[PDB]
Amino acid sequence: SPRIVQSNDLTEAAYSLSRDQKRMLYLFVDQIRKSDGICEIHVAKYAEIFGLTSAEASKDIRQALKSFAGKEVVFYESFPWFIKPAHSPSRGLYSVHINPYLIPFFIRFTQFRLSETKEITNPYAMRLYESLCQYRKPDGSGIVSLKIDWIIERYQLPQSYQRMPDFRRRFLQVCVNEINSRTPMRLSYIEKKKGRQTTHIVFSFRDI
DNA sequence: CCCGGACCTGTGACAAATTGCCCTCAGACGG
DNA sequence: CCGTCTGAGGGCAATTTGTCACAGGTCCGGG
Ligand SMILES: [Mg+2]
């Protein structure tokens, strides 16, 4: 299946995208990399990749696309994703205008096969699997320590998850569970503390 | 000695949002 | 021209995600 690659600067960038928008984003990166910034999406091709009907595909593309307006990307400098609205010349076909200034940030890199992520539902969990891959070894294992405040900024978790028990229950446990249930990776963790405060989360993983 | 207060934890409610489903009906194409 | 495959619309209830009040732990410094 298609092998996604992206600069680590994008993996660690700050942004908020839905699953459907992130799903579309993978195809843009695939299209762009296999070469001005003008990409295209066919309804019927999208449907076959993610096992959806044409109708629900159409609904997902259409609503994702109009929700891009005003979205911005921060590299620690802010940029908009799109500089022109989407439009359909033909039935079943969409044409999109990615900000050409994003190109160099697209192409010290991260890689994963698309089948690894296409069953994930929660977008924050898609971002965690993208951030673990950045440190993965050939054989398929790795271990990395991420700071909680940096997790909150980079993934832009909503504000009420600054209370740690809500963070645990509605983000961490759920996203660890899906990965273990929906990917070929087996993930565990432990909490790092300083006094009463939890400061980092330590992830360990292996393949198969 | 024990207090109220500033911290920490997990859970129960409810509100807002998202999931995969369903139904209708005209466009684009080829038989 | 019509019968069929698409896909652009309109909806639903069942789940997930996002928010906050309240009980219950600790340690500190004042009474
Ligand atoms: Mg959907």
If you measure from the C-alpha of residue A138 to the centroid of ligand 1, how many angstroms do you get, rounded to a whole number?
Answer: 34
Structure tokens at A51: 């096992």
Q: What is the dihedral of CA A60, A3, A206, A148, to 10 degrees?
A: -50
Residues A68 and A5 placed together within one structural domain of the fold: yes
- Cβ(A187)–Cβ(A164) below 8 Å: no
Residues A126 and A170 placed together within one structural domain of the fold: yes
Q: Give resolution in angstroms.
A: 3.3
Indicate the residue among A57, A89, A118 that finishes a domain: A118
Structure tokens at A42: 């066919």
Does residue A91 approach strand B to less than 7 Å at its CB? yes
Residues A178 and A193 placed together within one structural domain of the fold: yes
Residues A123 and A31 placed together within one structural domain of the fold: no
Residues A74 and A176 placed together within one structural domain of the fold: no
Indicate the residue among A118, A136, A155 that finishes a domain: A118
Q: Phi first, then psi: give them for residue A26, nearest 5 degrees.
A: -65, -35
The single-letter code of the amino acid at A86 is A
Distance, in Å, from the CA atom of A23 to the CA atom of A83, rounded to the nearest integer, reads 20
Does residue A171 approach strand C to less than 7 Å at its CB? yes
- Experimental determination technique: X-ray
* CA proximity to A121, closest of A207, A165, A60: A60
- Whole domain around residue A193: which residue ranges? 119-208
SS3 of chain A: the string is CCEEEEEHHHHCCECCCCHHHHHHHHHHHHHHHCCCCEEEEEHHHHHHHCCCCHHHHHHHHHHHHHCCCCCEEECCCEEECECCCCECCCCCEEEEEECHHHHHHHCCEEEEEHHHCCCCCCHHHHHHHHHHHCCCCCCCCEEEEEEHHHHHHHHCCCHHHHCHHHHHHHHHHHHHHHHHHHCCEEEEEEEEEECCEEEEEEEEEEEC
Indicate the residue among A80, A95, A118 that finishes a domain: A118
Residues A97 and A130 placed together within one structural domain of the fold: no
Does residue A166 approach strand B to less than 7 Å at its CB? yes
* CA proximity to A94, closest of A49, A38, A56, A149: A38
Distances (CA, A) of A182 to A108, A111, A127: 27, 18, 14
Residues A51 and A131 placed together within one structural domain of the fold: no
Protein-to-nucleotide distance from the CA of A160 to the C1' of C6, whole angstroms:
43
A56 DSSP β-pair partners? none
